[PDB]
């Protein structure tokens, strides 16, 4: 569970090396994009309940999945599904604030495809819902913060497929 700063520090330490110019380069590059990350981060927290309402509307609603015998039918399963959507968005914001995808390999995608094939959850409709969540966010944080954010939404999709 490392962000860009400790990633560089450990890579130094397995070599018993002090921080060289190359390491200082990578370091200053994070510190430069740093204010960018705090702002986009706020904009998502502020629009969280909302990104999710719009993403669900666009992909999941009025379909077979919400009608009886579908995995989102019953209130318990509708609420457990937008809970998952909350988890995806909160953790993609974390990994962007961090500069690094290891919180997502660690605390999110760690054997999720297995859990989803067990409970019988549709992965394709989830990747559908995440790609929409990808579109609504980028069209709210702006372009600089959006190339970056998208990477982490995309990292989730590739670990589910």
């Amino acid at each position: 569970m490392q962000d860009a700063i400790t990633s560089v520090i450990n890579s130094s330490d397995v070599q018993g090396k002090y921080l060289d110019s190359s390491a200082i380069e990578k370091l200053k590059g994070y510190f430069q994009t740093g204010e960018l990350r705090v702002r986009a981060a706020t904009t998502i927290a502020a629009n969280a309940a909302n990104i999710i309402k719009e993403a669900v509307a666009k992909s999941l609603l009025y379909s077979d999945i919400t009608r009886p015998g579908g995995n989102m039918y019953t209130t318990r399963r509708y609420a457990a599904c937008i809970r998952d959507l909350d988890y995806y968005l909160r953790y993609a914001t974390y990994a962007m604030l961090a500069g690094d995808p290891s919180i997502l390999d660690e605390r999110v995608l760690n054997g999720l495809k297995e859990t989803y094939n067990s409970l019988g959850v549709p992965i394709g409709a989830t990747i559908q819902a995440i790609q929409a969540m990808k579109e609504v966010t980028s069209g709210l944080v702006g372009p600089d913060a959006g190339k970056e954010m998208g990477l982490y939404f995309d990292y989730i999709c590739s670990g589910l497929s």
């Binding site: 569970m1 490392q2 962000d3 700063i5 400790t6 520090i9 450990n10 130094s12 330490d13 018993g16 002090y18 921080l19 200082i24 370091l27 200053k28 994070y30 510190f31 740093g34 204010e35 990350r37 705090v38 981060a41 706020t42 998502i44 927290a45 969280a48 909160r90 914001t93 974390y94 604030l97 961090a98 500069g99 919180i103 605390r107």
Partner: protein, 160 residues
């Protein structure tokens, strides 16, 4: 780093970051250049901060230099100053991170078990790091020096 620390604490409470937490990462990335310069000064004066502090160690704790002594000469005294370079390096790491966690993990968790195994007195390693501190607070001005020093004093204090 304090980014890792703020993410871990929000995740634990299953939330987004607070106002006070987004202000703390902003204060930190904008101090980032001050950090990278303090570290650079210490990495450049590496040989000096270690040799001059070791020379100073043997004059405040002389007991460890030969009669009995863990630093017993040409292969040993060399290894004692090695260990001083290991903690100088962990201190620059800490300063650019705004965090004592890379010093703790790499060199402070289990430091008493390891030195009682080798027979090394740990008051003497704490005293060594207190001597590298001085040699660094000379090479550093006003506020850079107050900051590098927060990190030398933590390392010393986890050693007794």
């Amino acid at each position: 780093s304090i980014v890792t620390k703020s993410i871990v604490n929000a995740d634990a409470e299953a939330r987004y970051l607070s106002p006070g937490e987004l202000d703390r990462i902003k204060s930190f990335v904008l101090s980032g250049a001050r950090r990278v310069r303090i570290a650079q000064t210490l990495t450049e004066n590496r040989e000096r901060i270690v040799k001059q502090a070791g020379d100073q160690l043997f004059q405040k704790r002389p007991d460890v230099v030969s009669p009995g002594g863990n630093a017993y000469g040409e292969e040993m005294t060399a290894t004692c100053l090695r260990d001083l370079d290991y903690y100088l390096r962990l201190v620059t790491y800490g300063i650019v991170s705004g965090d004592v966690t890379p010093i703790e993990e790499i060199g402070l968790v289990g430091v008493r078990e390891m030195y009682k195994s080798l027979g090394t007195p740990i008051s003497a390693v704490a005293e060594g790091v207190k001597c590298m501190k001085s040699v660094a607070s000379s090479l550093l001005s006003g506020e850079d020096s107050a900051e590098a020093g927060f990190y030398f004093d933590y390392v010393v204090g986890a050693m007794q």
